[PDB]
Amino acid sequence: TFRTLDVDSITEPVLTEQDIFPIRNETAEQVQAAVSQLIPQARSAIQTGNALQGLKTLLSYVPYGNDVQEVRTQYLNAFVDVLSNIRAADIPAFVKECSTEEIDNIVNFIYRGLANPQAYNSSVLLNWHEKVVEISGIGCIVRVLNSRPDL
Amino acid sequence: MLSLDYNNIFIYELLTERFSSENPSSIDQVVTDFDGVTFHISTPEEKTKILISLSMKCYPELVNYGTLDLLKQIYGAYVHEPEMGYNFSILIDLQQLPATDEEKEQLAMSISMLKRNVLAAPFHRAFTKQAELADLARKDPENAPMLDKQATSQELMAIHYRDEETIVLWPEHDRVTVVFSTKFREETDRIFGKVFLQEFVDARRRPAIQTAPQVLFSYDPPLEIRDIQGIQKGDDFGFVTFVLFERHFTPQNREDCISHIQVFRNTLHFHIKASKAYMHQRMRKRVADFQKVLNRAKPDVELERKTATGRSFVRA
Amino acid sequence: MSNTLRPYLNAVRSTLTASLALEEFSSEIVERQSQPEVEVGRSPEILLKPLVVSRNEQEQCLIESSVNSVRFSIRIKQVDEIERILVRKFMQFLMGRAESFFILRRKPVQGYDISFLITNYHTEEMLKHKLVDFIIEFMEEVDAEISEMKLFLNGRARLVAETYLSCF
Amino acid sequence: ASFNVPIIMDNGTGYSKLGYAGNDAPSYVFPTVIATRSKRATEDLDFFIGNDALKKASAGYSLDYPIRHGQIENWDHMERFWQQSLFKYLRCEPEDHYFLLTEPPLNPPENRENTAEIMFESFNCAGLYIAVQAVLALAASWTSSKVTDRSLTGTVVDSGDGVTHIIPVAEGYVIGSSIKTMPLAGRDVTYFVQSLLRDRNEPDSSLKTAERIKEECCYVCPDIVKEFSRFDREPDRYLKYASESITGHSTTIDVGFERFLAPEIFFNPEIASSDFLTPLPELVDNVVQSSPIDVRKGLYKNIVLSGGSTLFKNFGNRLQRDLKRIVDERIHRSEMLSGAKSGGVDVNVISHKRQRNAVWFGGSLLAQTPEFGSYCHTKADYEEYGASIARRYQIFGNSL
Amino acid sequence: TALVCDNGSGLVKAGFAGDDAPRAVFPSIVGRPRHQGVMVGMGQKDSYVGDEAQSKRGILTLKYPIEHGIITNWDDMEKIWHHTFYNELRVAPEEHPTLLTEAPLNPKANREKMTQIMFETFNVPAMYVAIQAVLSLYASGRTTGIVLDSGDGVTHNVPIYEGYALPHAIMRLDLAGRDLTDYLMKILTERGYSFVTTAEREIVRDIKEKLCYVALDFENEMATAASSSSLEKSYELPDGQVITIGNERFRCPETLFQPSFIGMESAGIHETTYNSIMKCDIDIRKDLYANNVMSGGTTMYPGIADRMQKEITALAPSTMKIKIIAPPERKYSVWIGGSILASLSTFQQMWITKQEYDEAGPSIVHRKCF
Amino acid sequence: TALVCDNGSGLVKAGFAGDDAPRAVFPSIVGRPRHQGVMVGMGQKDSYVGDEAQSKRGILTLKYPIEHGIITNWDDMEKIWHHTFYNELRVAPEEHPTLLTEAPLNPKANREKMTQIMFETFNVPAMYVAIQAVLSLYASGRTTGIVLDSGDGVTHNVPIYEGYALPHAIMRLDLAGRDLTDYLMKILTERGYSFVTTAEREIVRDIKEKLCYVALDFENEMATAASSSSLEKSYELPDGQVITIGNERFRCPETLFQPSFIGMESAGIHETTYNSIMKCDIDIRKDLYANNVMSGGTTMYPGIADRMQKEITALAPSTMKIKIIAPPERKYSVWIGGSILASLSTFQQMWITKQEYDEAGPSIVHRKCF
Ligand SMILES: Nc1ncnc2c1ncn2[C@@H]1O[C@H](COP(=O)(O)OP(=O)(O)O)[C@@H](O)[C@H]1O
Ligand SMILES: Nc1ncnc2c1ncn2[C@@H]1O[C@H](COP(=O)(O)OP(=O)(O)O)[C@@H](O)[C@H]1O
Ligand SMILES: Nc1ncnc2c1ncn2[C@@H]1O[C@H](COP(=O)(O)OP(=O)(O)O)[C@@H](O)[C@H]1O
Ligand SMILES: [Mg+2]
Ligand SMILES: [Mg+2]
Ligand SMILES: [Mg+2]
């Protein structure tokens, strides 16, 4: 019977996410190289005990795209490993000196971490969430709700 | 109910009616019971004569343990040829009844009690043989250990009385032990049944009920049943053991003890069901507590005055 | 209850309260009608990205959000088979009352134990800070509610054991 | 399916009829009532049901009827009523047996959903059929179970304690668009008898005494102004009814015009109610005239009566004469326009030996069928889809 | 909404749930003519009720159907309830649930006939019978206290702790404002004035309601009145002649503190209150002493709260604060608290309903209204 | 961090390992309403536990699930454990390993059932059950001594030498604080004060804690109290009434030294302590006499360490020193020592883990714990 045939999907094509969010102006191998330069700096900053500078350097660029899940998950592995190695007393002094765009990137990537607890320690991500929202306010979560879907 | 009745309530009420009735009508009534048992009650030749017949999957095992002798002792002249598809049968003639309301009542009770009477013969065989072993052990206390060791294998009864329960029992000179090789196949009843079987065994460790049979539990079988055919140690069975000592089947107490031990797993099954109704009332009470946490999000406004049918009211 | 749950329920509270910036919005696909857009998904520009807050692999929130509606769904602690039965049935009594708890769904979304839909109309007609207080007070208490129900089940298993075993 | 006999439970507003498929009567017929209490918690174990609940009002239990106006409305009490039905009275294990349940044609999707979860999760039955109740009452009307005695077309008027509904069925199919319901049945005529005893200030107006005055003293007359006049003309029309009180002493009640005025509730529902106005003969006409034209002779030729509240003396004769009047006045309006006589239609209202419990006897006869286990929900369906499996209306047309 | 009918011994107080005060307040009286009805027509009636009886009283025998909180005449009580619904509130009782009230330790049959007449005469959809002192505690904004309620026919003490009543500690005393009116007739006779008829009993009730008061120390007031004009003052009868009274103004109310003035062998209202607190468990007594709640018209005397506090302070140990709560609206606190209760949402489940009465008979009240 | 509970017979002491004192200390009590709630919309609860049962006690019957260190009511013990986790410490029981605690010579079923409830009802990750007297040496900083532990339900002696317990020389006495409350209720009756209810027992427990002491020589103290009022003291009841107390102020605690006051045939705490030392091997006795440790609330009486040193000095040979270490924190020393033990790095392999329980059943506790 006719009632179940989807005509709308072919007679009125809906907006795509790239009609809402601008296309990435970098190729997949170009962003994969840019992150592969940063992950070794982020790992090295843990060994010198400077994990705060490990985050400040890792956070200087972020990968996005549905074509880059492998390097997005490698960047998230490094991000959660860096956040797990910062001492909990350093967080308030570091968060107040981040820009609004660095804060937006921190609260975005703690959200990607909280989505996968079998890989990532939620206990440190929730501690970071409490302190980032306490110091920078509710609007940083509002910017994550509104953020791009391929971050 | 906190406790199950031992007798079939339908057969009791029907016979209590027909034994009093001025004008008996015909009947043709198949009636279910627990443990896959079934009865047929009918008037197959006259409205005057009722045939009651029992069907029970373990009846051939029960005949090996002296069941026909006990059923002839209980039902006497009323015993009849078995009906087709039924294992035992009794014919009661409504013009041939006892002369008193109290003899009629205990006959209506006796016929309603028929599932626990057919199933009582292995327990009477164990109780009467324990009295022989008790007298021999009272004769020579140093020979008694060998009598108990041979009676543990030579005088053992096993009844595969339903496909997920084996009742195993034997006499020794001071006891009857009975093991329920017991299981719940329905998964929520297996989960609640673990709590019921655990708290059952822990109850017997408390001071208030030390007068009860000793109870033991496991999920391998008790040593003396491990090689009984159809017992199996990996097959999700638990094994509830009751040790009845001489005080639990004293002559004032034998028939109540038999009635009450046979219904063990039926009371546990029934209470695993009735516990869900309890959990559901426990739940909906705190659904009504969580209402009060949402009601504080309703902003306060006066409703217009309404009559009991909900029609608007125009006063005050 | 909130010492162990405090970091988690603070992240849930903060992001549920950010997510409830709701508005009246009529359908772009149907005329003279409005629908909770998170529940239909037919126009993606007015959907906000779905956010997961999590304490544990077993204890999780999904927050799905839109111009006129939030869907909030939770996985709750079920560390044994008694709790799996007790939780499932408690959520079924709670979702069976959903007309009187106006922000409940009648069914959970698949892989979640209970779910909530807060629409534009609920933020207009109810105190929305008391809606997020009800969500977090539900998440704070449900583990204590369910553990107390398995105490009542233990207590009944003792009632029938002592009643049975005392009439030999 | 299992080879064990299906279990039949007709849970009415007044009475529950419980039994096994293929028996010559229900095993139990008792009120759909629960007696409930109003350091371990056991007050949900302490209840009673049926005849044993009526004995408990003097022991301080609160009695309630969990079914009112045909519909279950207290699921705590209906779950406890079913567990006590299954484990005390029917003395059965749900895991071994398939069940036939019943409810009114109108009944909410919510009720069949709530019924399925109690049956499959509380009790864990092997399978469940929730039957359309008066469709079973058609099958109880047969002279025998043999296929040559079947009459698969007929209107069925079911009138129990809580609701009366008129169902058209043709060739075995229920014409769900044409169902009519009147919210008045055997309980509303008891409340009317009770109200009339109470208006005369009679020594007893307890509900049992008003009930017993329906069963014994009441009947259906032709016309209440002629019958009020007959209660002037003839003196032995007033009866005297002997009743025994709750505290155990005798009383005598004069019973008068409620003998005819109380069964008139079906033929003039403006006596009972502000909210329902159409009398039963006009309501049966509305069922057959909304029904397809080719089945109208069959639906008038076989108007089956069902449920205890159709048993009033002269009830089927009043329905037949008043419906024959409506039907022939409509046919004669057409003969008088056309100038030619019709063949007419015979209106037959059928009272039969199984009329008191026709839903249970039909449920027994239909659950005996070799195919029955294929029409049930099996618990394996419920393990996949849950209580939503029972939610869709069987009798009415569904969208989607 | 629901009706609240505080049908007390002396005044009927009636109105709607959620209203600030009762909108019907009238004498609990039926009057019947005692003289030769000679003029034909004239708008005459077989009997009169409430304010109509009170205004015609010079030609009527007046009688209350309720005495000591018990209905003695059900035919006249139906006449009063009819007057509440149809004349005074102007409602169909078949459209409204009714909250009724009675004193504790009443006959069981009073509750039964009261539920029967409400369902069978007035055809009510639902009803409840509340204990009057439990209602008066809602009107206090309290969930613990001891309520001393005294009306026209009965005085009672009910102690409640955190919403639990202690029913063993409940006290009743069949002495209240009608006994004080009868005693005021007996002592007015000593100064020169005889009041004898049921109509003259309403004049001396009106004297009691505005001349009488409670002395803080009775023997000092009695000596002050015996030695000065200063306690004496006057009242004007319907006939325009003047009554002067002195120690009769405080001797009448002192009967609540000294019941032996009317020949009773009982503790006064202060010591009955203390005996009720001392029947309660030892931990609750401190919060009962801090929450003595006064109610009913017989608590409306000037000085009675100051006297009650003085008397209970002498009985209790000095180590704690006795507090007497005597609101200016305590004339109506039972009705006020009934209008609170009848407007609560859990109470909507506590009503006896028509269907539930029809299934159970009038005994339903004993297993639902406590 | 681990949890640690002394589920004492009278108080729960609960908290986290490595903290200096219990986070939660509350009555080991469940209370249930004895009266009917007449007031609608009140916060009525099915039962109350701990400080909320103690606060509401005037309307509750109060029960202790533990009697003589044995859990007699498992439902009320589960209510208390649920209250420790979700209300008092407000942590989920699955998150922290829990050190529970027990008296020696208990029923083996008590410890198995406690183990089964923690792993299957509260789903704890790991747990242990320590002996209360072993923990009292950890708190005292000892590895040698004899601990006299006396709580609410049981008094016990455990001798330990250089970390080895001597389980044949362990003594139990089912006489401690509750038996002294029972006896003080009995001997209060002879001065004319009646304490009967479960709530009046809690007032008498408070009288015992506030006013009782141990008399260094009982017959000189009895002669002193017979000679003058100088030994008498006063207590004020919650009613504001005052009771005065004299020889029954020290004749109550003497039941520890004279168990025949409560009619039981046994040695007093000094003779069970000496008999425990004399059951030990002869070389260790000389060090046990110098290291008598006192613990638990029934060792808190003024003068008890002086009485105890006097009596042990009369029993023991005069050639060597008797020293008794009764520290001011000894009321919590079992919990303090449990916090030390559960905090040791060398203890972390000694827990029973959930994975190790469900391959062995609850009898695992008899081979992992002493
Ligand atoms: N002989 C009779 N005459 C009239 N009404 C009767 C008669 N016998 C029973 N009833 C009435 O029939 C009703 C019960 O019918 P039933 O079919 O069992 O109702 P239900 O299924 O809805 O519970 C009751 O009102 C009962 O009093
Ligand atoms: N101001 C007052 N001073 C003294 N007595 C009063 C006063 N007002 C009312 N009363 C008395 O109180 C009684 C009526 O009180 P009420 O509470 O309405 O009693 P009830 O409820 O029992 O009918 C009458 O005896 C009346 O005279
Ligand atoms: N200061 C005190 N003086 C005398 N007895 C005390 C004192 N403090 C507490 N108690 C008694 O000791 C009990 C509590 O001691 P505790 O060591 O905590 O016992 P438990 O471990 O058995 O709960 C109290 O209930 C009371 O009987
Ligand atoms: Mg019916
Ligand atoms: Mg009054
Ligand atoms: Mg202790």
Numbering used by the authors:
A (entry chain G): 2 to 152
B (entry chain D): 1 to 219, 221 to 317
C (entry chain F): 1 to 168
D (entry chain A): 2 to 39, 66 to 427
E (entry chain O), F (entry chain Q): 6 to 375
Paper text:
Arp2/3 complex is composed of seven protein subunits and nucleates the formation of actin filament branches on the sides of preexisting “mother” actin filaments. Elongation of these branched actin filament networks powers eukaryotic cell and organelle movements. ATP hydrolysis and release of the γ-phosphate from Arp2 and/or Arp3 regulate the turnover and mechanical stability of branched filament networks.
This structure serves as a reference standard for the mature branch junction. All 8 actin subunits and Arp3 have well defined densities in their active sites for ADP and a coordinated Mg2+ ion. The map shows clearly that Arp2 has bound nucleotide triphosphate that is consistent with Mg2+-ATP, although incomplete occupancy of the γ-phosphate suggests that partial hydrolysis and phosphate dissociation may have occurred. At 2.7 Å resolution, Arp3 D-loop residues 39-57 are disordered as in previous structures, but we also visualize weak density for the D-loop C-terminal region (residues 58-67) in the branch junction. Arp2/3 complex binds on the convex side of the bent mother filament. The majority of filament bending (~1°) occurs between subunits M2 and M3, while the remainder is distributed between subunits M3–M6. In the branch junction with bound ADP contacts of Arp3 with the mother filaments bury 187.4 Å2 on actin subunit M4 and 393.5 Å2 on actin subunit M3, a total of 581 Å2.
